[model samples]
Target chain A: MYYPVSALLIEYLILAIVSKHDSYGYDISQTIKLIASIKESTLYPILKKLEKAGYLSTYTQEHQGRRRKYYHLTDSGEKHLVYLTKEWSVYKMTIDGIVEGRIRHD
Target chain B: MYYPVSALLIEYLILAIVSKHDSYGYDISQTIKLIASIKESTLYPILKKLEKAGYLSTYTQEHQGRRRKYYHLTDSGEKHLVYLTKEWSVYKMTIDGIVEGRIRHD
Candidate 1:
């Protein structure tokens, strides 16, 4: 329901992938599947949405005589990526704090 | 994009909140805002979707001279909660490993 958090997960992975360099849709999906096991239905739409949101920039490039679209994060996208990584760290720790009884779950 | 993970975040919080017992819309929204600083726009729509996804069940109840809807997680939802929690643990750690130079970022 609150996928913004999950949205961040997708974004974080996308950022990580693009941070390394540009990537096409197939490569992104392949990487996630290799590392995260995300489904096609789950990953592709989010990829498209991220492109639409301008968190990422895209272009078509020829690879092995096939047309493929590549994606790269914009500066703004990197900004969000940093924000998400930072927040995710705190968020996880906060949840841990709750479980550890340092922070009350109530 | 990967809000499925963040969707899990919202679901986890909602589960934690209602595990104290059942809750109405206002109560869920209020608790999320107080604890997580979630916005109304973000919280409400997700609430609707969770209901639609059958992760939660709801009913109309009269309270304070007004009609209010209450939500409770179904068994399937609880299973999903457990699955998400487990997956999220791995997900966070995987991302961390990348940062720590353990999991290669490629």
Candidate 2:
């Protein structure tokens, strides 16, 4: 079973974001906040890590005459998106099966 | 698109862990290391957050005559798993479609 803040899901989410479209640091940070209210400190580190991992590629863009780092998914990142999707299916189906035979224990 | 270390995947992974089997803090920490070598500090805080979110339940279990907190998935946790699975599927299909006629702009 995967743990929370588990690197697997973090990596998965990063790849998924970049796969959709090229984005900048603010775009990703804003996206996370919209989805789950993640703190600013938590994101930049992960972004740097993903960039180092080759799952993402970054380029500079002029936004309002200021340089901003934009991130996009690489082939590796795209493949990772596929992998996360498949693993999530396995996880979901497993839970559904377990629930059918399980008693609610709280 | 979603952000990495985005709360979504962290939540997804957390729910996934408890859904599979009842486990303790050490168990999950070990699982993360085996899967991706996540730091211990990174995990405990996430665990506390997940517990607070009502997605996971913890009980004290005696192991080796000592108390250990065992985690189990709550109903909310299970539902979140299904959601993550569905979202990941959308992400994957989107990528596959994009890659078909996508040009590498590097």
Candidate 3:
């Protein structure tokens, strides 16, 4: 029932996920795929955008036999995650209130 | 925090609002504008779309020598609103769990 999610939410999610633990691209995409059936094309661009925006810091690590790019949230990205989380909470309640008609009436 | 909401969510909001009681374009937009800064251009189309899709039924009434349109959810639209509400609740928790790191990790 979860339709395709947006880039902004996906972007915030990447930050929050990375903040949880340093992550590589594949791992991050898989975790998100659990809840959202997002496209690989869509996810890759947002990761690149986050890295470009200085919201993520990246490094290559040798795992098994290959060098894999890993990501962690930059300080700015951490702050952005905080903002996203706070706003999401407020938004959740607001939608709940409105849909439930506890907030307003037309 | 609430960046511009997307059309699908906005579309859902319009249905939910109308389901609360019959509403007009301006009233629905005003109610939604409380949380999201949507455009007039954006709302009209969705309402029209819903009406076209048979999710909403429209009626025109005259007041003060002007015709005004009022809307109410059709049976399909009400069922659609239910689906939207269900999906939104699931989406809300998934994001919460993911961001809070209670859901998964890399």
Candidate 4:
């Protein structure tokens, strides 16, 4: 990873993936690993943080008794995803502006 | 410093700035601070590291007496900047693709 794949960015990824559809730990990490070589252990804590923050929560009613897990976004989580999307846009633009010499410090 | 302005990124920024003109430590650090809130302490070591790598060398003949400082890139250093420009491009694209959901891990 050219950038160290920040925790904030990882959280944004989790919210984004869950926004599409609730996901399990392995699947989310797999999708995340597409961009960053993060470990499952690294992923879980963030997942738990998101859950604790009410960005993600699991629904196990479908499992009936086995209690399999899948992470679905809370209503606020969706808003956070959109918020992070814009934040990411601004950030990348800043880096590009610097890299391309389009922006300069006086 | 949304991305934490990593040491590697700082090195890239340093080389790119010096490539435009031989610069003193403060001037280079100022330009870098345009994008990241880096301290002079953080920057000096990096500049030193670049000099040791032979990517930069100090030119003092113009000063003639006081031994004031400025850094100019070596031939290899110029090549290094070009290499990093492509490297930065590829790096930014990976991040964009990931954030946009255009790239996915299997």
User: What would the per-residue lDDT of candidate 4 be over residues B55-103, giving only the tens digit for each residue?
Assistant: 9998764454656579998897889888877777776677666656676
Give DockQ: model 2: 0.08
The number of the candidate with the highest TM-score is 3
How does candidate 2 fare on TM-score? Answer: 0.47
Q: Give the residue spans of candidate 2 off by over 4 A.
A: A1-7, A102-106, B1-106
lDDT of each: 0.66, 0.61, 0.83, 0.78
User: What fraction of native interface contacts is shared by candidate 4?
Assistant: 0.33
The estimated TM-scores of all candidates read 0.54, 0.47, 0.87, 0.82
- Tens-digit per-residue lDDT, B23-105, candidate 2: 88776655443333346677888888888987788999899999999988888878877777677555444333333323222
What is the alpha-carbon lDDT for the whole of candidate 4?
0.78
Which is the winner by lDDT between candidate 1 and candidate 2?
1
- Candidate 4 vs. truth: CA RMSD? 3.3
lDDT (tens digit, per residue) of candidate 3 on B33-99: 8777778987898899999999999998875687889998999999889988888878878887888
Model 3 sits at an interface RMSD, in angstroms, of 2.3
Q: Which candidate leads in lDDT?
A: 3
Q: What is the lDDT of residue A16 in candidate 1?
A: 70
**Candidate 3 lDDT tens digits, A12-59:** 788989998898898899888867778889899899999998999899
Instruction: State the DockQ, from 0 to 1, for candidate 3.
Output: 0.45
- Which stretch of 10 consecutive residues in model 2 chain A shows the poorest summed lDDT? A97-106
